Design a binder for this molecule. Structure first.
Ligand SMILES: Nc1ncnc2c1ncn2[C@@H]1O[C@H](COP(=O)(O)O)[C@@H](O)[C@H]1O
Ligand SMILES: Nc1ncnc2c1ncn2[C@@H]1O[C@H](COP(=O)(O)O)[C@@H](O)[C@H]1O
Ligand SMILES: [Ca+2]
Ligand SMILES: [Ca+2]
Ligand SMILES: [Ca+2]
Ligand SMILES: [Ca+2]
Ligand SMILES: [Ca+2]
Lengths: 207, 206
């Protein structure tokens, strides 16, 4: 099946086509039918298998646009590094053109990021230390999050962000949809499924 | 998503609708895009999940009819018991009435089944012991199999069919699509996935 065969808004498909993307990768073709229906899932696949779109397209499809100034984000994506936060934000901006995506990460001051969050955001893509910093400061508001994504959960474990991640997830509404992506599925990932997800289906691309 | 969103022929859709079926179950929803494109999958699931239509629909869609006398089967489904073979064959006929489906199982005479295989078959749903007997005899020729399904692999393991199942898969062409259903993915199932499947996607709903 091609992207056009999936229940995706015309504007999203147009963006996909423009970016040279027509046919889902295996993780995408298996995950989208469930993720687009609002279901929780765990995606286990080598990096470069197309994991980002498997959660970006659900975020894009689920969220309607909003022009309301200072609005709080309706999606949160956590990633272990600044490099990945920038990459994921780029991709999500590109397939959710109707959404404002704000990236937050270390290696710079607070001022520009706070200014962005104050203006309003529909999705935030963040490293967990910086996100928790802003949560504590009152500038990142997670009370309206409808979709939470943990991207590379095993790297977030290996960089030591367990408490930050759990703290962030705990500040989101339990009504949310949660997607967890992790190449390996260590003990921590399993704890997260139990404690933060709703009967998620596991999709694992082997080889 | 609805069944009509998937690349299924209108007669198939009409039949599902006739039975009140419009909305795929989780395992069907996740499996069908890949299964209908000929890709290998492992479904971690038991009865109650809708796993049967997850492999029956791709068979029904893939295989055109043929009236060729003596023709060899193009789909093989292995199951642990007579009971399940009868159930699966029934469901395969329900969605693919254009295909000759032959159930092969123990606890009965050879004659009927051997006759049917010699006359020609499009799909065979078999228990592994009797299937291997027919393979040995040349009665069951697997050289044209396009889809191989291992239904309830844990039960096949628990009954002692590991050797028969491996040998039957070893006799099909590696170009085939293989779909494996195993509730617990024991070590044997992992062995099968490595030896007999190609980059399988695992879908666990239980
Ligand atoms: N459906 C697709 N077709 C072709 N390339 C894709 C598709 N989805 C993702 N990619 C690319 O796969 C690469 C790795 O993706 P990821 O696993 O998200 O890092 C990137 O170059 C993506 O643009
Ligand atoms: N999409 C569906 N909607 C409703 N019932 C279904 C669907 N798929 C399978 N079933 C039924 O679910 C029961 C268990 O299926 P199975 O898990 O294949 O043994 C059987 O009665 C099926 O016919
Ligand atoms: Ca950080
Ligand atoms: Ca920490
Ligand atoms: Ca369509
Ligand atoms: Ca037998
Ligand atoms: Ca044996």
């Amino acid at each position: 099946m091609e992207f056009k065969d999936f229940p995706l808004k015309p504007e999203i498909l147009e963006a996909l086509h423009g970016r040279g993307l027509t046919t889902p990768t295996p993780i995408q073709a298996a995950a989208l039918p469930l993720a687009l229906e609002g279901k929780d899932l765990i995606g286990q696949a080598r990096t470069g298998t197309g994991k980002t779109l498997a959660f970006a397209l659900p975020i894009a499809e689920r969220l309607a646009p909003s022009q309301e100034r200072g609005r709080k984000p309706r999606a949160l994506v956590l990633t272990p590094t600044r490099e990945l936060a920038l990459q994921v934000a780029s991709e999500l901006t590109a397939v959710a053109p109707h959404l404002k995506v704000v990236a937050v990460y270390g290696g710079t001051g607070y001022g520009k990021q706070k200014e962005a969050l104050l203006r309003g955001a529909d999705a935030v893509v963040a490293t967990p230390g910086r996100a928790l910093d802003y949560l504590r400061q009152g500038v990142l508001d997670l009370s309206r999050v409808e979709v939470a994504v943990l991207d590379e959960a095993d790297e977030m474990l290996s960089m030591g962000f367990e408490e930050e991640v759990e703290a962030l997830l705990s500040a989101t509404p339990p009504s949310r949809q949660t997607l967890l992506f992790s190449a390996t599925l260590p003990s921590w990932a399993k704890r997260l499924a139990e404690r933060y997800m709703k009967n998620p289906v596991l999709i694992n691309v082997i080889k």
